[PDB]
Amino acid sequence: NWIGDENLTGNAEAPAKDDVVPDKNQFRYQKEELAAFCHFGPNTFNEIEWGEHYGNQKPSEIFTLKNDFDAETLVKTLKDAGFKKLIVTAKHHDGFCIWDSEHTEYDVKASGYKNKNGESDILAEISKACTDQNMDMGLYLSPWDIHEPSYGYKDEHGNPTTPDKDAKDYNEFYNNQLEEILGNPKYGNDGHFVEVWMAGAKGSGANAQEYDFKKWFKTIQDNEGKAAGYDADCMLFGAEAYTTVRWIGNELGIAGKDTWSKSKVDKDKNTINSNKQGNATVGFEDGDQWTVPEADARITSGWFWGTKKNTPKTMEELSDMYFNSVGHNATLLLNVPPNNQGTVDKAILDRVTEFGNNIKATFKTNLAKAEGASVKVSEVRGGAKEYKPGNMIDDNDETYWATSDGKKSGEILIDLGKETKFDVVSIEEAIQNGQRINNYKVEYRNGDSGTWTLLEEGKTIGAKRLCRTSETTARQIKITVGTCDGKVPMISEIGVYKSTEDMEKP
Ligand SMILES: *O[C@@]1(*)[C@](*)(O*)C(*)(*)(O*)[O@](*)(*)[C]([C])[C@@]1(*)O*
Ligand SMILES: [Ca+2]
Ligand SMILES: [Ca+2]
Numbered sequence: 001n002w003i004g005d006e007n008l009t010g011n012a013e014a015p016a017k018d019d020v021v022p023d024k025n026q027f028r029y030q031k032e033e034l035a036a037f038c039h040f041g042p043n044t045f046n047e048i049e050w051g052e053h054y055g056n057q058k059p060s061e062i063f064t065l066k067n068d069f070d071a072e073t074l075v076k077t078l079k080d081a082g083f084k085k086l087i088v089t090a091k092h093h094d095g096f097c098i099w100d101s102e103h104t105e106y107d108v109k110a111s112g113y114k115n116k117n118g119e120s121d122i123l124a125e126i127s128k129a130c131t132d133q134n135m136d137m138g139l140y141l142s143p144w145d146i147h148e149p150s151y152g153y154k155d156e157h158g159n160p161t162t163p164d165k166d167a168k169d170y171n172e173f174y175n176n177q178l179e180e181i182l183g184n185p186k187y188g189n190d191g192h193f194v195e196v197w198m199a200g201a202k203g204s205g206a207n208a209q210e211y212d213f214k215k216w217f218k219t220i221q222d223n224e225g226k227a228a229g230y231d232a233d234c235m236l237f238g239a240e241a242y243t244t245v246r247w248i249g250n251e252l253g254i255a256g257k258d259t260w261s262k263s264k265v266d267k268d269k270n271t272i273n274s275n276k277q278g279n280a281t282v283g284f285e286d287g288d289q290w291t292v293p294e295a296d297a298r299i300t301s302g303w304f305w306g307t308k309k310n311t312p313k314t315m316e317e318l319s320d321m322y323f324n325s326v327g328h329n330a331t332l333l334l335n336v337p338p339n340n341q342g343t344v345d346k347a348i349l350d351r352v353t354e355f356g357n358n359i360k361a362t363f364k365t366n367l368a369k370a371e372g373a374s375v376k377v378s379e380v381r382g383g384a385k386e387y388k389p390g391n392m393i394d395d396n397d398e399t400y401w402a403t404s405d406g407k408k409s410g411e412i413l414i415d416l417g418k419e420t421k422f423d424v425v426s427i428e429e430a431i432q433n434g435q436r437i438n439n440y441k442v443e444y445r446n447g448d449s450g451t452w453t454l455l456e457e458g459k460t461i462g463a464k465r466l467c468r469t470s471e472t473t474a475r476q477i478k479i480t481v482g483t484c485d486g487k488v489p490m491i492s493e494i495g496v497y498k499s500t501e502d503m504e505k506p
C-alpha cells in the first residue's frame with residue numbers, strides 16, 4: 001500500500017541530525033558537484049609538469065607571456081558548462097608567483113608581463129573575471145617551494161644547517177603570502193576564497209621543512225572564515241587535522257563506489273585517516289570530521305598545457321569520470337589549463353562546453369515527473385506533509401522524505417506512467433543532517449506487479465548516488481534505503497534519466 005502526497009495531516013518532529021554534519025561551505029560544495037582547476041605559470045612555457053630545473057633563470061626567461069591573459073573566455077566557458085568554482089595555482093612547486101608579491105622578486109611583476117591596462121597580476125585578472133561572473137574561487141599555494149631561499153634550514157650564508165640556526169623562516173614567508181593575497185580584496189570572488197589548496201606532493205630529494213599549519217589556518221580564517229564574518233570557515237585541502245576537503249587518493253577522477261564524506265582526525269597528534277581502500281579514500285561511516293571527497297583530474301594528459309599534452313580527453317573518458325566521481329558522493333575538480341598565449345586551446349574549450357552540454361541534456365528531463373508518473377513511499381514520517389514523497393521531486397535540497405522514528409528503512413516506488421527507456425537513477429541524501437544511509441537497492445519491472453529485476457545495490461548515498469546502467473525499459477523503479485538502528489533515512493531528491501548518446505555506459 002503505497003503512500004502519495006494527498007491527505008497528509010499528521011505531525012512529527014524533524015529527525016535528529018547526525019553528530020557529524022557538513023558546514024555551510026562543505027554542503028554548498030557537495031551540491032555544486034563540479035569545480036575547475038587552473039594550472040598556469042612558468043611550466044606552461046617550458047614543456048614540463050614539475051619546474052624543478054629553472055635554477056637562477058630570471059622570471060622574464062621562464063614566464064614569457066606576450067599577450068594579455070584571457071581570463072574572461074576561460075571563466076565564461078567554465079560557468080556555462082556548470083563549473084561553480086575555479087581553483088588557481090597562485091604558486092606551484094617552482095615558487096613562481098603569478099600575483100604581484102612584495103615578499104619575492106620571483107613573480108609575474110618581475111617577468112615583464114603587462115596587460116592592456118599596464119598591470120602585472122594574473123591572479124587579479126582571473127579574480128576580476130570570476131567576480132564579474134560570480135564564480136567562487138580557490139587558492140592553490142604550493143607548500144613545497146624550490147626557489148624561495150627561506151625554504152629549508154639554511155644559515156645566513158645560504159648553506160644547510162639545523163632548524164635553530166635557520167636564518168629565514170619559510171613558515172613566516174608562506175604566512176605573509178597568505179595574508180598578502182587573502183587580505184587584498186582584488187583577489188577572490190569579490191575578495192573571497194572558499195578553499196585553500198595545500199599540495200602534499202614534494203620531490204623525494206627536496207630539503208626538509210616542517211610546516212606551521214596552525215599559523216596558516218589562523219591567517220586563512222581571519223580573512224576568509226567565520227572570524228572574517230562569513231557563514232563558514234574557508235575549506236582546507238592538505239592541512240592535516242584541519243582538513244575539510246580531502247584528496248580522493250588518486251589523480252584519475254575516481255571515487256570508491258561506497259564513499260563517506262567523513263574522516264577520522266586526531267587534533268592532538270595532527271593526523272587524518274580517510275580510509276584508503278584500493279586507489280581511493282572511502283571515508284568512515286563513524287568518521288568524526290566531515291571531509292568533502294574531492295576527485296582532482298586533468299582534462300589533458302598533464303596539469304600544465306604543452307605542445308605534446310594539449311589533446312583533451314574524449315567524452316567517453318569524461319563521462320566515465322563524471323559517473324565515478326559526482327555519481328559516488330565526490331566532487332570533480334577538473335583542470336583546464338591555459339596555453340603559452342594566455343588563452344585556452346579551442347579544442348580544450350570546445351570539449352569543456354561539450355562535457356557541460358552533455359551533463360545538462362542528460363539531467364534535463366526527470367522521468368519521475370513526466371506525464372502520468374508518480375513517486376510514492378512505503379511510509380511517511382508521522383503521516384506529516386513536511387516529509388511527503390513529493391519532497392523528493394521539488395528541486396529543493398532543503399525538503400526531504402523520511403520515515404517515522406523506529407523505521408530505519410523505507411521504499412520509494414517511482415511509476416514512470418508507461419514503458420519508459422532510462423539508464424540513470426539519481427538519489428540524493430539530505431546530507432545537511434548527516435550522511436547515515438548504509439544500504440540501498442534499486443530494482444525495476446514492467447507493469448505494476450510481479451518480480452523485480454536488480455539494477456544496483458550498495459552501501460552509501462551521500463550528496464549524490466548515480467546508478468548508471470545500459471539502456472533499460474521499465475514501468476516501475478523501486479528504491480530501498482536504510483540506516484542503522486535508532487535513525488531514519490532522509491532523501492532530498494531523486495530522479496530517473498535517459499542519458500545523451502555520449503554519456504551512455506560503454
Ligand atoms: O603538480 C601536481 C602536484 O604535485 C599535486 O600536489 O597536485 C596536482 C594538482 C598538481 O599541481
Ligand atoms: Ca629557512
Ligand atoms: Ca579576502
Ligand SMILES: [Ca+2]
Pocket residue numbers: 391392393394395396397398399400492493
Ligand atoms: Ca527536495
Ligand SMILES: [Cl-]
Pocket residue numbers: 047048049050
Ligand atoms: Cl614532465
Ligand SMILES: [Cl-]
Pocket residue numbers: 012013381382403404405
Ligand atoms: Cl516520527
Ligand SMILES: [Mg+2]
Pocket residue numbers: 031
Ligand atoms: Mg542540485
Ligand SMILES: [Mg+2]
Pocket residue numbers: 068069070071115125
Ligand atoms: Mg586579461
Ligand SMILES: [Mg+2]
Pocket residue numbers: 100101102103104105106107109110
Ligand atoms: Mg615581487
